[PDB]
């Protein structure tokens, strides 16, 4: 049972993990165009503002649904356009450290991103639990896509919005690779957001990455309460803000319009690829959230 599975992070001395009721194993029916009350008590079937998404993405309420024990989400071409309509849902309740959040999900066999992530209300702080481009092959680029099919991006962002700036860790360990082709099975992707300066990523119950300390979380001081981006002044906040849980798929600009201009580095679904619906359906069996509490 999903609640029998141990949480792999360490709750602390004389602490245990307490299941949060905002968790969801999607064992109800929620038709795409009429979600119903069970879905809507925990989830909104859009992004947390009216932005319809990055690159060719045009998020739609009716591109998410739940059936057969899973949250499901699929992609179709927007008629008369290059855009792709796609699913996006957001939690109605926010989460904050310390918290362990884990999704059992099956990365799409698609060049589109399959995402489970966290985002603060003011869009300045982000934790990416799963961001993965799972296709075996890409017709757009005309190449084997196993460079990406075997990788899971595990990361976090801090932003300045006024003029837009974006930081994330870029070291090699931010892309986890086993030999596992992620699209073949459901896997568990989790994060222990322990405090503003410490993140631990777990895949299938195993610690795969620790992101700890100021130098890697916010070296450019984008989280300064006073004068963001100024490293002479330290009023850094770290990842402190409560966050919405977001599950979506995305066409991202660096993929559909790559900086190089080359078709060979352009990874986005052709119409032929979109005609296979299962390949472009992201499935989440469950998402569970625990908080550490005193024994």
Q: Does 26 bind Na ion (CB under 5 A)?
A: yes
Partner whose binding site includes residue 181, from Mg ion, Na ion, its own copies, none (CB under 5 to 8 Å by kind): Mg ion
Choose between 38 and 242: whose C-beta lies nearer to its own copies. Answer: 242
Q: How far apart are CA 53 and CA 47, in angstroms?
A: 8
Closest CA to 142 of 264, 51, 276: 264
Per CB under 8 A, contacts with its own copies among 42-101 are 94, 96
Q: How far apart are CA 185 and CA 279, in angstroms?
A: 13
- In the complex, the smallest distance separating the C-beta of residue 136 from Mg ion, rounded to whole angstroms, is 11
- In the complex, the smallest distance separating the C-beta of residue 134 from Mg ion, rounded to whole angstroms, is 12
Find the part of the chain contacting its own copies (CB under 8 A) among 58-66, 191-199, 257-265, 285-293: 191-199
Q: Tell me the sheet residues that pair with 230.
A: none
Each residue of 194-225: b (16+ CB within 10 Å) or e?
A: bebbbbbbbbeeeebbebeeeebbbeebbbbe
Active site residues: 126, 131
Q: How far apart are CA 73 and CA 272, in angstroms?
A: 19
Q: How far apart are CA 174 and CA 29, in angstroms?
A: 36
Find the part of the chain contacting its own copies (CB under 8 A) among 28-36, 45-53, 107-115, 120-128: 120-128
- In the complex, the smallest distance separating the C-beta of residue 177 from Mg ion, rounded to whole angstroms, is 12
Q: Does 38 bind Na ion (CB under 5 A)?
A: no
Binding site listing = 47-49, 123, 157, 161, 166, 168, 250
Q: Tell me the sheet residues that pair with 73.
A: 64, 282
Query: Count of CB atoms within 10 A of residue 11's CB?
Result: 19
Binding site listing for substrate = 47-49, 123, 157, 161, 166, 168, 250
Identify the residue among 160, 181, 208, 274 touching Mg ion (CB under 5 A): 181
- In the complex, the smallest distance separating the C-beta of residue 149 from Mg ion, rounded to whole angstroms, is 10
Tokens representing 37 are 């009350």
Q: Does 187 bind its own copies (CB under 8 A)?
A: no
Closest CA to 282 of 98, 153, 106: 106
DSSP state of 30: B
Find the part of the chain contacting its own copies (CB under 8 A) among 12-20, 111-119, 235-243, 270-278: 235-243
Contacts of 147 (CB under 8 A, 6+ apart): none
Closest CA to 237 of 256, 224, 219: 224
CB 244 within 8 A of CB 118: yes
Q: Does 25 bind Na ion (CB under 5 A)?
A: yes
- In the complex, the smallest distance separating the C-beta of residue 139 from its own copies, rounded to whole angstroms, is 44
Choose between 119 and 203: whose C-beta lies nearer to Na ion. Answer: 203
Choose between 144 and 166: whose C-beta lies nearer to Mg ion. Answer: 144
DSSP state of 7: P
Binding site for its own copies (CB under 8 A): 94, 96, 120-122, 195-197, 225-226, 233-238, 240-242
* Interaction site with Na ion (CB under 5 A): 25-26, 69, 205, 283, 285-286
């Amino acid at each position: 049972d999903w609640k029998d599975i141990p949480v792999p992070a360490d709750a602390g001395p004389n602490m245990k993990w307490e299941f949060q009721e905002i968790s969801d194993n999607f064992e109800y029916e929620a038709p795409a165009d009429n979600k119903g009350s069970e879905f809507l008590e925990k989830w909104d079937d859009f992004y947390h503002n009216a932005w319809a998404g990055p690159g060719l993405t045009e998020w739609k309420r009716d591109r998410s649904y739940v059936a057969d024990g899973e949250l499901k989400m699929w992609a179709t071409r927007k008629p008369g356009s290059d855009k792709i309509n796609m699913g996006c849902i957001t939690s109605k309740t926010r989460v904050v450290y310390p918290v362990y959040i884990e999704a059992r999900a099956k990365v799409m066999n698609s060049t589109l991103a399959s995402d489970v992530w966290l985002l603060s209300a003011d869009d300045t702080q982000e934790i990416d639990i799963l961001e993965a481009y799972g296709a075996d092959y890409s017709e757009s680029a005309g190449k084997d896509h196993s460079y990406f099919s075997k990788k899971v991006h595990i990361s976090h962002h801090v932003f300045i919005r006024d003029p837009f700036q974006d930081y994330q860790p870029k070291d090699a360990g931010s892309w986890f690779e086993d030999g596992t082709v992620w699209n073949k099975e459901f896997h568990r992707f989790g994060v222990y957001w322990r405090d503003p300066w410490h993140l631990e990523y777990y895949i299938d119950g195993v610690l795969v990455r620790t992101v700890s300390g100021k130098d890697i979380i916010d070296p450019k001081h984008f989280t300064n309460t006073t004068d963001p981006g100024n490293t002479e002044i330290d009023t850094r906040t770290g990842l402190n803000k409560e966050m919405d849980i977001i599950i979506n798929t995305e066409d991202q600009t660096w993929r559909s319009s790559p900086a190089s201009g080359l078709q060979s580095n352009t990874y986005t679904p052709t119409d032929n690829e979109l005609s296979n619906i299962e390949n472009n359906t992201f499935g989440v069996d469950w998402i569970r959230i625990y908080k550490p509490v005193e024994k």
